[PDB]
Amino acid sequence: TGETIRSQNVMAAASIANIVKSSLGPVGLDKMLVDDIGDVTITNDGATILKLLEVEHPAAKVLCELADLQDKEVGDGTTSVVIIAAELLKNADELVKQKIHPTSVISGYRLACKEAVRYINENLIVNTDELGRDCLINAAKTSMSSKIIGINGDFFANMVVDAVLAIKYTDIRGQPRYPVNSVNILKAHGRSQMESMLISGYALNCVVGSQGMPKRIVNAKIACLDFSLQKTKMKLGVQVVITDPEKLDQIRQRESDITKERIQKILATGANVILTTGGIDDMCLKYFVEAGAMAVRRVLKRDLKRIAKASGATILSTLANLEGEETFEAAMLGQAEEVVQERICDDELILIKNTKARTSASIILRGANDFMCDEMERSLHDALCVVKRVLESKSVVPGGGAVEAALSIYLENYATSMGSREQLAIAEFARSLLVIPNTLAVNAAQDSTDLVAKLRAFHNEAQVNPERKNLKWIGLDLSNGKPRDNKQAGVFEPTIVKVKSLKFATEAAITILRIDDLIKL
């Protein structure tokens, strides 16, 4: 109790922080979260692992909640915020053993947080659609394989990163912006992996219905069906009993002949192309092909929805009212510009080129082996996530661990000028910025102390920029402590992920430091 219970709290938060310190990024170390005593889950990323983990200290419970609050706003910053938070405690703690009030250091942590945002504001790169964020090439390259798509790594990074930053794409029906609801990119093996290209339109994975089926139609109306067409057994069209054998047969043979007539009415309402998320039988597929309609089967769900919303107007992915082969009730008028079936990736696949409501563009990736394609699933996840933050807030910040270390001397420069009791409080805020370059050293398997030293060694004034790197701070790497330029392989962060983290970590630092009990009164 008293000072002692507080110190146990500092120590508790430290233990939590060491875990996420050694589990940050995809280059972290996986941990074991024994969930019972027989059951375990093993995975990496620091925020995710706290939720899985039984937290039981009060200092530990607030820091798990903190990580969760930060996620709602932005899914980055979440492993990080916790680590900064804890460090404040540890640094503050020796000043409480000395003579300096917790209250006196904590006010100067608020002041210090105000200066730090002031730095972020004057330090920004806002052209980032021609050299990207976390560099251009580097963005996609890091979560690739280093020896299955690590020799294709330049070629494929250029394809995907450039395409995320600036391409035409749908949003939510007649709204033209950058894609923050992602790009439709599929991975399918075939051909060269050096032959990859962008096609204007959507990319579809599907099984053809070609046996009479027209494979080119200029201008088309698109029925994207979340409902499996099928046909199915329905009661009699005349009578409500049977009692003769001639009526039994006539009613059944009427089932084929009525369907052919319905197809033409569906065209006249708005069909030239049917995209069905389920499959279509041979019996049902024949009615469409003879009539002059492109009916494709086994169209992937991800593709079908994303074509639907770009095709706009009224569409039957927003509803699903339909049974069998009945006439269309005008809820399936998806709009498109032209539909070319093209042979690409040694499979024939339909390319719905553009739509009339909101134009699109897609990449059909080519591997050689299934193994290559699997790997680009991971490449693609990193490129999309990195770029997603660039698109919302064009203001972004060059440096990751370079900002923090630039900032460490800036705060101390501010600290010298302030003087008094507050000069030491600011100083200790500044020491905790330095955990950021340590945590990345950890994941990289680099020296920590060596690594921060050398970054502060490159200095003129405080300001981070790609102009110098051997005389000013800029970037890091996740596998080296070397500084890098932004046309090279430095790290960037978005503005939002950095301001929200520093702040959140200060409000946390005050709450854990406060208590001087937990005891039964």
Binding site: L53, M234, D347
Partner: protein, 509 residues
């Protein structure tokens, strides 16, 4: 909770304690593990899956050992003993020394470079095997069976496996990869002559398809796939109204006979006489197919129905409407009932959908049946691996020594700080050679030395040490062979296990 140094040492012990006895079991020479019960009884085992499941492990890292042998078992079923040995010895040799300096992630990067180093060596070392020549694949199967230690029923099993796997080979995926062995099954028949073991087409069912009426012989008529909905409806095609009244009962029944009547009519058109319904088939419904003059097979599980669908090789349909010769039953199904015993066994033969086969095994009893069936299980795993990759690798520790010097040469050439982990993966390989030395009863020093010497002269193409002759020997000469793919996959899983375990530096509950 464990932290830091506790964890690294823990990993190595847990791996290690599993390993000691389980490494010895590899090879024709097999040491037998005693497990002692609290009830004072004994279970004796050579099979790695059995040892692991039975023992009480307290430590989460140990549990990861167990689960990776599940990974292996699911892919092949041989080499299951091997993966934990291999995975253990990566950690022993590399870890503790390099931690003190502190670089874990480095040891991990090195493992996967080395892994690639080994995959490439294998293609050169191996020569092709003809994947349609029985004789050449046979000797390979002969190597694998004698690990289990049955060598009498084995001889039959090998040959029956060869035709079974080959006939269920037809997987297309644009690259023509074969992992298909899921169409294959073993039909077990207690009783009869011990030597009638053959293969017959399609898929043959008995696990719940033993019934007293099934049409004795079908030599033309079709099977009609159904997941229908052959059962009555009290409305049109869904139930909208309840029977609780005399009035409700009367009205409803008319609708119920009609629904059934139109279903049977769509079933009969394509000419069956044997008709399978998964579920959605009633006491009134089945009575309707008898009156249709159609033998009905009914109330037999969903797993049997997946099996029967594969046997004609024709797709299933849940579509209740207009079932054609074109949609269901495509090709010819055929149905033979034999009484081997006075019990009804159902063969379904003929698959269109290029081929398919399953195995008849006839014991003279339950016990006699079992011996063949396990050894056949080993057998069709080999047949498959040979089909998958059409190279056969020389057995024993000859392959291991080839890779052992390639890493000595690579690690020197690169001169990174990855160099020393390369060197620890080179020595982790050598356990398999040490196990084979122990098997004869000769000193580890003398035979390893010679093996290393053979690298220098003849490059260990096939000159390894074999444990059943205790001497350096050409493995080709003996008729010791195993398939490339089995070697590659065992190696693969072991690096994953070594990498994942090394990433756990902390364990926190």
């Amino acid at each position: 909770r464990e932290s830091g140094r506790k964890v690294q040492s823990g990993n190595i012990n847990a791996a290690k304690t599993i390993a000691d006895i389980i490494r010895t079991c590899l090879g024709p020479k097999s040491m037998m593990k005693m497990l002692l019960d609290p009830m004072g009884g004994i279970v004796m085992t050579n099979d790695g899956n059995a040892i692991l499941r039975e023992i009480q492990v307290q430590h989460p890292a140990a549990k990861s050992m167990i689960e990776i042998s599940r990974t292996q078992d699911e892919e092949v079923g041989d080499g299951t003993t091997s993966v934990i040995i291999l995975a253990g010895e990566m950690l022993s040799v590399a870890e503790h020394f390099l931690e003190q300096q502190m670089h874990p992630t480095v040891v991990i990067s090195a493992y996967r470079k080395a892994l690639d180093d080994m995959i490439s060596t294998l293609k050169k070392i191996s020569i092709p095997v003809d994947i349609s020549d029985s004789d050449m694949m046979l000797n390979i199967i002969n190597s694998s069976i004698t690990t289990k230690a049955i060598s009498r029923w084995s001889s039959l099993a090998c040959n029956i496996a060869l035709d079974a796997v080959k006939m269920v080979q037809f997987e297309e995926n644009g690259r023509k990869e074969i992992d298909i062995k899921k169409y294959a099954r073993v039909e077990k028949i207690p009783g009869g002559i011990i030597e009638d073991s053959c293969v017959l087409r399609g898929v043959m069912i008995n696990k719940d398809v033993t019934h007293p009426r099934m049409r004795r012989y079908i030599k033309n008529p079709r099977i009609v796939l159904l997941d229908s909905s052959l059962e009555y409806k009290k409305g049109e095609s869904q139930t909208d109204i309840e029977i609780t009244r005399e009035e409700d009962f009367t009205r409803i029944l008319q609708m119920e006979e009609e629904y059934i009547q139109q279903l049977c009519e769509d079933i009969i058109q394509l000419k069956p006489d044997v008709v399978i319904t998964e579920k959605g088939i009633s006491d009134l419904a089945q009575h309707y197919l008898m009156r249709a003059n159609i033998t009905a097979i009914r109330r037999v599980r969903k797993t049997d129905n997946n099996r029967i669908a594969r046997a004609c090789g024709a797709r299933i349909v849940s579509r209740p409407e207009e079932l054609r010769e074109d949609d269901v039953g495509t090709g010819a199904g055929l149905l033979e009932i034999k009484k081997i015993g006075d019990e009804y066994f159902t063969f379904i033969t003929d698959c269109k959908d290029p081929k398919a086969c399953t195995i008849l095994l006839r014991g003279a009893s339950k016990e006699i049946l079992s011996e063949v069936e396990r050894n056949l299980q080993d057998a069709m795993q080999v047949c498959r691996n040979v089909l998958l990759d059409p190279q056969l690798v020389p057995g024993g520790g000859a392959s291991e020594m080839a890779v052992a010097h390639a890493l000595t040469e690579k690690s020197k050439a690169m001169t990174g700080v990855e160099q020393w982990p390369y060197r620890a993966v080179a020595q982790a390989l050598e356990v398999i050679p040490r196990t084979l030395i122990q098997n004869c009863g000769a000193s580890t020093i003398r035979l390893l030395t010679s093996l290393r010497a053979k690298h220098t002269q003849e490059n260990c193409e096939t000159w390894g040490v074999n444990g059943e002759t205790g001497t350096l020997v050409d493995m080709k000469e003996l008729g010791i062979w195993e398939p490339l793919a089995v070697k590659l996959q065992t190696y693969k899983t072991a690096v994953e296990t070594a990498v994942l375990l090394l990433r756990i530096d902390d364990i926190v509950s």
